[PDB]
Amino acid sequence: SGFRKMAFPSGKVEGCMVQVTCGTTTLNGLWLDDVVYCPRHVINYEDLLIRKSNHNFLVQAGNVQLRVIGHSMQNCVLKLKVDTANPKTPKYKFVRIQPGQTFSVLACYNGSPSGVYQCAMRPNFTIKGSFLNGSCGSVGFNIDYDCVSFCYMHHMELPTGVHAGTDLEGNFYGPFVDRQTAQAAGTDTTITVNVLAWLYAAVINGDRWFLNRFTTTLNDFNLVAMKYNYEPLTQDHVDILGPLSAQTGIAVLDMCASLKELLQNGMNGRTILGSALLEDEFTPFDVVRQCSGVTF
Amino acid sequence: SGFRKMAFPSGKVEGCMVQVTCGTTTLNGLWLDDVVYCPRHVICTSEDMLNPNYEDLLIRKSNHNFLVQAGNVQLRVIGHSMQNCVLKLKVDTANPKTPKYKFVRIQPGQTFSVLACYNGSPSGVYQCAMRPNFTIKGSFLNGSCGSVGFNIDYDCVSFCYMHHMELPTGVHAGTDLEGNFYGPFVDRQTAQAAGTDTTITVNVLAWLYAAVINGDRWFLNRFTTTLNDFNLVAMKYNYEPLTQDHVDILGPLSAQTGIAVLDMCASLKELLQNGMNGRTILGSALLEDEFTPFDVVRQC
Numbered sequence: 128s129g130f131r132k133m134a135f136p137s138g139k140v141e142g143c144m145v146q147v148t149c150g151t152t153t154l155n156g157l158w159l160d161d162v163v164y165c166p167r168h169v170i171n172y173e174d175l176l177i178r179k180s181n182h183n184f185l186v187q188a189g190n191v192q193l194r195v196i197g198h199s200m201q202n203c204v205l206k207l208k209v210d211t212a213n214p215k216t217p218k219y220k221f222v223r224i225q226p227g228q229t230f231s232v233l234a235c236y237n238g239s240p241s242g243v244y245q246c247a248m249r250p251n252f253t254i255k256g257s258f259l260n261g262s263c264g265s266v267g268f269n270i271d272y273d274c275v276s277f278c279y280m281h282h283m284e285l286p287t288g289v290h291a292g293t294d295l296e297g298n299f300y301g302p303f304v305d306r307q308t309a310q311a312a313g314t315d316t317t318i319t320v321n322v323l324a325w326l327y328a329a330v331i332n333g334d335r336w337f338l339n340r341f342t343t344t345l346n347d348f349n350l351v352a353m354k355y356n357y358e359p360l361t362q363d364h365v366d367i368l369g370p371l372s373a374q375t376g377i378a379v380l381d382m383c384a385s386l387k388e389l390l391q392n393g394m395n396g397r398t399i400l401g402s403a404l405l406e407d408e409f410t411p412f413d414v415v416r417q418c419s420g421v422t423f
Numbered sequence: 424s425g426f427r428k429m430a431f432p433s434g435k436v437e438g439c440m441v442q443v444t445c446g447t448t449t450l451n452g453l454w455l456d457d458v459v460y461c462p463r464h465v466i467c468t469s470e471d472m473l474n475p476n477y478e479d480l481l482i483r484k485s486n487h488n489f490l491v492q493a494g495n496v497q498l499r500v501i502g503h504s505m506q507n508c509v510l511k512l513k514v515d516t517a518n519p520k521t522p523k524y525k526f527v528r529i530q531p532g533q534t535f536s537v538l539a540c541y542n543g544s545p546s547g548v549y550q551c552a553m554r555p556n557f558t559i560k561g562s563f564l565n566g567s568c569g570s571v572g573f574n575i576d577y578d579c580v581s582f583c584y585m586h587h588m589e590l591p592t593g594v595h596a597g598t599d600l601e602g603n604f605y606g607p608f609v610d611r612q613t614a615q616a617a618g619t620d621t622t623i624t625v626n627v628l629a630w631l632y633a634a635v636i637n638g639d640r641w642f643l644n645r646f647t648t649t650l651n652d653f654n655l656v657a658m659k660y661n662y663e664p665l666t667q668d669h670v671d672i673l674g675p676l677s678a679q680t681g682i683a684v685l686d687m688c689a690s691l692k693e694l695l696q697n698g699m700n701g702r703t704i705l706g707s708a709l710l711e712d713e714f715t716p717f718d719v720v721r722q723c
């Protein structure tokens with residue numbers, strides 16, 4: 128029993144964190160095999176990069192200085208070729224995630240990991256993280272068996288306190304650019320399929336006060352979701368929720384009628400899994416994994 | 424900016440998790456140097472759990488009855504001893520991945536990270552607090568016994584909790600790494616219940632200071648309070664009494680924000696009276712009590 132916001136064990140990623148210094152700027156890098164990946168803003172980026180030599184980039188792995196022997200740019204990520212392969216390199220892939228998907232973040236400062244938290248890629252492509260100055264280059268990831276799938280690298284904080292970054296191939300999530308200019312996060316929405324998954328997790332843990340005898344059509348629910356700044360629920364989301372529906376005996380559209388009643392009438396002084404708000408940062412897969420105990 | 428429930432990086436603890444099997448029971452052990460620490464209830468059957476005599480059960484065991492597995496390697500047990508509710512299995516190999524560590528006993532209100540494990544394999548990490556009633560509101564399934572709680576301040580891992588059992592309300596009970604339980608609990612399947620829980624007042628105050636540091640002041644008011652009047656009101660909402668030690672501990676956050684502790688106590692009194700009125704504080708519609716004054720200073 129119990130339901131916590133749970134991150135993946137961070138050990139496989141900790142063994143990859145390094146410090147990258149270029150001039151006055153110090154940030155974090157990801158050392159995989161013989162390449163160190165970091166935000167290109169550590170340095171017209173092609174014009175700024177052509178003026179740099181390998182010895183201008185100082186890379187520190189623990190108390191050891193790594194020698195940079197090459198450098199190249201891929202989108203908004205700088206790739207520093209080093210003379211030593213990371214002996215701690217885990218099995219890994221670079222994957223691009225979609226809004227609504229969750230991942231763990233290993234927040235780092237000076238190439239030293241300080242904390243790990245779980246979060247979701249918001250529908251507006253920002254993340255509600257917890258980062259201070261020096262956190263740039265911190266990474267987001269998921270784990271599948273023994274394979275680490277790197278999905279995010281931190282680049283900047285927006286004026287509202289939310290965060291923006293890229294996949295590990297340097298492509299930004301969202302309409303952001305890596306420079307000091309007027310940029311704002313778009314109006315955010317609630318991840319509907321995730322709220323539904325969290326309602327199924329509450330039923331599994333013995334919280335059934337919000338259940339009702341009613342059902343709804345997907346069209347009627349989507350009109351209600353549009354009214355309350357909730358993302359549209361598609362047939363794919365309904366299919367994905369299938370296992371949780373079979374486990375609890377509550378049809379997905381039956382759980383939508385509960386969500387509709389919660390949106391129109393509130394919680395009435397009650398909580399669900401210790402929360403007075405509807406939680407949207409647990410995917411259907413996170414709920415099944417936390418209520419089954421899958422290990423890495 | 425931002426404020427998240429943040430756990431310590433778990434790598435130093437992952438390299439210590441092993442699987443301990445005794446007969447039909449399989450649970451987790453903590454491998455530090457040449458000793459594997461695990462709940463002594465690994466020697467029990469489900470029947471034995473009503474009134475186990477651990478000394479009588481342990482004397483019937485030999486070293487080869489305990490199967491210890493570290494990854495794909497079987498460790499050889501060369502000795503065994505019991506210390507309170509923890510079993511200490513001497514093994515023939517020192518853990519090469521043993522970090523710098525200490526065993527510390529924490530007090531209610533203190534927070535720590537938990538590395539939840541099954542079959543000696545880590546599955547997840549979360550942050551939690553030792554409740555005033557000595558239970559933890561964890562997320563643990565069958566097989567999670569032996570999972571550990573820790574803090575990593577600087578490069579030293581301070582182990583403070585080992586998971587032993589789930590109570591009927593879904594909350595969890597365990598021991599420090601010397602095998603002494605937190606709370607009036609016993610490793611017996613006897614009728615045991617968590618005492619009435621309360622809110623950790625010093626932690627809610629710390630979290631209100633974190634909100635002010637992140638730019639939010641909507642909840643502040645022009646009033647102050649005496650410590651006694653604050654306690655008379657807060658105890659009516661099931662809040663723990665605030666002591667002079669708590670007021671002293673909040674000193675740095677008071678100096679940073681310019682809001683005296685007893686003025687912050689007056690905003691807390693008002694929040695309990697009024698509720699939030701559709702507003703949130705650091706993305707929460709409830710008053711959060713699982714961040715200590717130390718966690719707020721560390722994260723903000």
Ligand SMILES: NC(=O)c1ccc2cncc(NC(=O)Cc3cccc(Cl)c3)c2c1
Binds near residue numbers: 128565
């Ligand atoms: N499904 C379960 O059996 C279950 C679920 C969540 C569980 C979460 N934590 C622990 C489990 N087990 C026990 O508490 C074992 C036990 C029993 C009595 C006395 C002691 Cl000291 C130990 C858990 C089991």
Ligand SMILES: [Cl-]
Binds near residue numbers: 528529530533
């Ligand atoms: Cl303590």
